[PDB]
Write an enzyme that holds these catalytic residues in place. Sequence first.
Site, PDB file in Angstrom:
ATOM      1  N   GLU A 166     -36.530  -9.955  32.120  1.00 46.42           N
ATOM      2  CA  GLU A 166     -36.245  -9.922  33.555  1.00 46.42           C
ATOM      3  C   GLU A 166     -37.533  -9.777  34.386  1.00 46.42           C
ATOM      4  O   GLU A 166     -37.495  -9.358  35.529  1.00 46.42           O
ATOM      5  CB  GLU A 166     -35.229  -8.817  33.880  1.00 46.42           C
ATOM      6  CG  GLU A 166     -33.865  -9.015  33.230  1.00 46.42           C
ATOM      7  CD  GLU A 166     -33.087 -10.201  33.788  1.00 46.42           C
ATOM      8  OE1 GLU A 166     -31.987 -10.505  33.272  1.00 46.42           O
ATOM      9  OE2 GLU A 166     -33.570 -10.840  34.749  1.00 46.42           O
ATOM     10  N   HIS A 213     -34.203  -1.467  36.553  1.00 53.64           N
ATOM     11  CA  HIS A 213     -32.883  -2.028  36.273  1.00 53.64           C
ATOM     12  C   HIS A 213     -32.242  -1.203  35.174  1.00 53.64           C
ATOM     13  O   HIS A 213     -32.915  -0.848  34.201  1.00 53.64           O
ATOM     14  CB  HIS A 213     -33.010  -3.479  35.798  1.00 53.64           C
ATOM     15  CG  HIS A 213     -31.764  -4.063  35.191  1.00 53.64           C
ATOM     16  ND1 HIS A 213     -30.583  -4.209  35.889  1.00 53.64           N
ATOM     17  CD2 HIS A 213     -31.545  -4.614  33.970  1.00 53.64           C
ATOM     18  CE1 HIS A 213     -29.682  -4.783  35.112  1.00 53.64           C
ATOM     19  NE2 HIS A 213     -30.238  -5.041  33.945  1.00 53.64           N
ATOM     20  N   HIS A 245     -27.969  -0.269  33.370  1.00 57.46           N
ATOM     21  CA  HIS A 245     -26.560  -0.620  33.304  1.00 57.46           C
ATOM     22  C   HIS A 245     -25.738   0.612  33.687  1.00 57.46           C
ATOM     23  O   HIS A 245     -25.082   1.244  32.857  1.00 57.46           O
ATOM     24  CB  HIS A 245     -26.240  -1.188  31.912  1.00 57.46           C
ATOM     25  CG  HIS A 245     -26.967  -2.469  31.613  1.00 57.46           C
ATOM     26  ND1 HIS A 245     -26.912  -3.089  30.381  1.00 57.46           N
ATOM     27  CD2 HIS A 245     -27.700  -3.286  32.409  1.00 57.46           C
ATOM     28  CE1 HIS A 245     -27.613  -4.209  30.424  1.00 57.46           C
ATOM     29  NE2 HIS A 245     -28.097  -4.358  31.642  1.00 57.46           N
ATOM     30  N   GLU A 251     -24.779  12.756  50.875  1.00 58.38           N
ATOM     31  CA  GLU A 251     -26.198  12.418  50.976  1.00 58.38           C
ATOM     32  C   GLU A 251     -26.485  10.914  51.002  1.00 58.38           C
ATOM     33  O   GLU A 251     -27.575  10.502  51.379  1.00 58.38           O
ATOM     34  CB  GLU A 251     -26.941  13.007  49.773  1.00 58.38           C
ATOM     35  CG  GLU A 251     -26.568  12.294  48.481  1.00 58.38           C
ATOM     36  CD  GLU A 251     -26.786  13.102  47.231  1.00 58.38           C
ATOM     37  OE1 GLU A 251     -27.568  14.094  47.254  1.00 58.38           O
ATOM     38  OE2 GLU A 251     -26.168  12.693  46.215  1.00 58.38           O
ATOM     39  N   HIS A 277     -22.490  -6.172  35.578  1.00 54.95           N
ATOM     40  CA  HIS A 277     -23.765  -6.088  34.872  1.00 54.95           C
ATOM     41  C   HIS A 277     -24.539  -4.806  35.160  1.00 54.95           C
ATOM     42  O   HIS A 277     -24.735  -4.012  34.271  1.00 54.95           O
ATOM     43  CB  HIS A 277     -24.630  -7.316  35.191  1.00 54.95           C
ATOM     44  CG  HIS A 277     -25.917  -7.389  34.416  1.00 54.95           C
ATOM     45  ND1 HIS A 277     -26.588  -8.577  34.219  1.00 54.95           N
ATOM     46  CD2 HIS A 277     -26.660  -6.435  33.794  1.00 54.95           C
ATOM     47  CE1 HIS A 277     -27.688  -8.351  33.521  1.00 54.95           C
ATOM     48  NE2 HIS A 277     -27.753  -7.060  33.239  1.00 54.95           N
TER      49      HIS A 277
HETATM   50 ZN   LIG Z   1     -29.275  -5.979  32.235  1.00 54.75          ZN
END
Ligand SMILES: [Zn+2]
Lengths: 274, 274, 274, 274
Positions: D117, D141, D143, D171, D212
């Site tokens: 990525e 990133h 999950h 918050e 995802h």
């Molecule tokens: Zn991923």
Amino acid sequence: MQNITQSWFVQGMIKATTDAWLKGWDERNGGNLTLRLDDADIAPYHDNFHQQPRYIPLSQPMPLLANTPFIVTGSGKFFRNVQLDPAFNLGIVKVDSDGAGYHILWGLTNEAVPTSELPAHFLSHCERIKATNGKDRVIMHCHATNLIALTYVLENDTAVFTRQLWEGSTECLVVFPDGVGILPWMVPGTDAIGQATAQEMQKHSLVLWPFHGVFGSGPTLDETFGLIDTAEKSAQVLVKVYSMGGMKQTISREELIALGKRFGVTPLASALAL
Amino acid sequence: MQNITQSWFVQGMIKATTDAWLKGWDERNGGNLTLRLDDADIAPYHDNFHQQPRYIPLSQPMPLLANTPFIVTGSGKFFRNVQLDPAFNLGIVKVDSDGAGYHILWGLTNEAVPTSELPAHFLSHCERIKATNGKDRVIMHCHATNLIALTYVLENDTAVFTRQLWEGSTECLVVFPDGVGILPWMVPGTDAIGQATAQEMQKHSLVLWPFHGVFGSGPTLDETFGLIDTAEKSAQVLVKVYSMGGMKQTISREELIALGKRFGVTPLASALAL
Amino acid sequence: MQNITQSWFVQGMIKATTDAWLKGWDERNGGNLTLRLDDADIAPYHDNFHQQPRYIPLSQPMPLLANTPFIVTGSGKFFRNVQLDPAFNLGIVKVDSDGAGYHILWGLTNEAVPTSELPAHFLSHCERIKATNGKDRVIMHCHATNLIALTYVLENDTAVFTRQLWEGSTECLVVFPDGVGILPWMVPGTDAIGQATAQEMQKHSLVLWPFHGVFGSGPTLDETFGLIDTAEKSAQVLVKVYSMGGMKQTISREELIALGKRFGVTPLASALAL
Amino acid sequence: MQNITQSWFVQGMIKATTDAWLKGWDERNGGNLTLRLDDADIAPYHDNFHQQPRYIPLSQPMPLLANTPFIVTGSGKFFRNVQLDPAFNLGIVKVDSDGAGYHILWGLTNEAVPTSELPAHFLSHCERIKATNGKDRVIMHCHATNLIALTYVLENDTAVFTRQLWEGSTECLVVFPDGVGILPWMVPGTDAIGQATAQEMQKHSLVLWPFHGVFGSGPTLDETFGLIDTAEKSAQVLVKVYSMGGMKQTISREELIALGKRFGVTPLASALAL
Ligand SMILES: [Zn+2]
Ligand SMILES: [Zn+2]
Ligand SMILES: [Zn+2]
Ligand SMILES: [Zn+2]
């Protein structure tokens, strides 16, 4: 001699209480744990015993436990803290020759006393000694989250509860073929709830206290912890299944029968008959 | 040289079993794990072997495994304890020249034996060796909580179960494009369930045992653990979604097709067709 | 003299914040914690103090706290990091002789300041000091997950909320017989929300902030943590039960009354009357 | 000079990846993390660099990143393992003077490469550099379980999703006033998904990938981790609430407006208008 804190039984008590803490079963001082020892286990550590062991009467005479040593959790103590100071949170008690009371041979420092559920513990040990010919040596109580939740939604009936828990993980019938006894709700810390638990322990290794928690009995700390962990795991599965709308399919009576035959266990008749 | 306990394979077995314990997949003695080694892995450690290795027959002849060493979990042993005493909870076995049985070269002390799911393990290794031209080396079984829960609410069908698991996390089609084989419920610890699992392993790297758990295969401990962790993560998401009333939207067939094309994997046709 | 980081009070702050982090109650800088000390606690460590302690005014005069030292969490600091750098994440402040402000004696390095919920903390300390004759010494706020969730689905009413939490674990009535005060939603970090919390602390040891979290008061870190953990454990049980379609049976008024009488506690009348 | 493994940035990468592993957000190789460094951070550690640093082209020219070093997670590496072997699982790369490609100065051993990525990461760093005048240095990133679950049940729309997440913990509006951008499902590991993410990063610090996971940007590892942890905590609360039948009451528009006023933030107009 190594210090008594390094003994298998002190280390075992630390592992079980700490593991139970991490499971989320023992918030605050929730839960209590007692392990029956032999004289030969503690005799080598006699130099670490209190110079003048404190005496405390039992709630009632327990002559079956005469001269019997146990390691126990202390009242109001946090399972989370046992690892930090074993002598403050645990102790070794020895029941006197009449079964009238006990001396605190080690630990329970700073005027600590054994768990306030001592009646449930010691009366249950008595019944499990008789039921297992002296094989069982541990009584554990904890606030097992999913088992507790199920007591608000399932019928509080030994057969029904046993049968659902058997269904919620294949191993369950093999681990607890005698099932799970369910008491009515009762006031904690009483000889009533203690004796009621002990009576259920005549017929089951697991007993549920609705809206409260679980008691388990077994030969070792690991086997008793694992017994409770198995029932609670099944409960965890069931809570997910019920939350998703209930069982579309499940373990059948025929499959439970085949399971019992293969592993040479006799399933609680009332639960099988459902 | 250094003790075999410090070897990559003993340390790897400790890591996988301990991680699975922490996941809540391995209550009591739930789960089992076997890793195929080469002679070269264990040869340097011969001084750590048992003076007189015990011989145990296999359940049936497995000539494909002749002369092959494995590291395995012991029967009745707790995943939680592997880290505390590797030799008590694990063993290294080497299958004899006929594939008739094995010698216990290291571990499984105090008369322990390999997992009672050894047929499922070794028969599955055989089928995966054939399916992957010897690349796969690990079979892992555990009681993956959400996967277990889904077996009570989803149709116990390979196509249906695969398709839902692909939908529950985008990576899943890429991690297990061959899908997840689902058996009927079967009695544990038999050669029937072992053989049925191995058959499913011809076509899938994951196999579900309804109301019980999962088996996974892969080339390394991490890849096999990660394979199961991926399916179980998807199951965890699905349990949440189903508990919230079901999918308002999801990954479409078109999207699964595009995903497979980009990563050069061929998705199980029956699952894709739904 | 050992460094102040090895003191019982810094170590206790580390344990409570770290434990709360592990519970999932303190994402980012969520939560804050203040512990009232005695001069004698900190006096031995004066060499570790800042050479020129910074002065900050209090939001309003608090004469009851004149000359009083506290250990506090810093604003924007992560509970997760307290264990890694106590001096960066915590501070010791001493309120001046007219209760107008405080000096930062130790920690809160690189121009850090005490928690932005200091009004809620210090005003609640004042009310708890009066309410408990100086016994309470800790105010703890955290983002207790299940308690937060319940504020979107239960009536945000002290009686209703208290009664449900009592029902969700047997011990709760004994642990918090005064119940749980529920405020309306209010803007965080204001004297309004601080003052409103302090008022509720006149009558309860637990206060809920809807859609936000919880405040608890107690004599020690462990007792206060344990108080919150008990309420949050009951909330966790309730969330499961409600997710499974609600209470089929539960703890009755009669049972709650019996429980209060066994343990010598007066249950909050309004919650008992439901 | 100490080994680069002891540097603040390698230690920081270990902490973030390990914490994300413990949260359950990074099964298998799920997730990726990149941190922009300065030449001065890595210069002292040249003796730890590779004998012959491998050159790899970027997917497209990125002149804004000319001469810029990053520490990155490797492709197919497990977050769980970063703590065990930082060099196997992480790398330091330096983009060349043209912004055409980079050299792998340290780590990514055994022919490993940066995250697949990388387009999403490096393109997002570029847009965040512009959007924040060079303040932001991290793209993460993972999950995140509950955020993922919500993408199957909430409208995958920036305004709607932002508004629900704001409601699920007080918050949130202050931590992410610009909200959470939601993309359509897209094929992972493409420059398409990478640039779509980078464009959303022009207007938001959080971006969701339906079915995802999530991307976040911030100035430090902790601030970016905390940003995601906040959104995921709110999602966790929402999943409980939705599982219990939905909101009976919630944070109102009026209350969100007052919150934004107090903390001097401008809430995303579209989310506030709902
Ligand atoms: Zn991923
Ligand atoms: Zn209890
Ligand atoms: Zn099994
Ligand atoms: Zn807060």
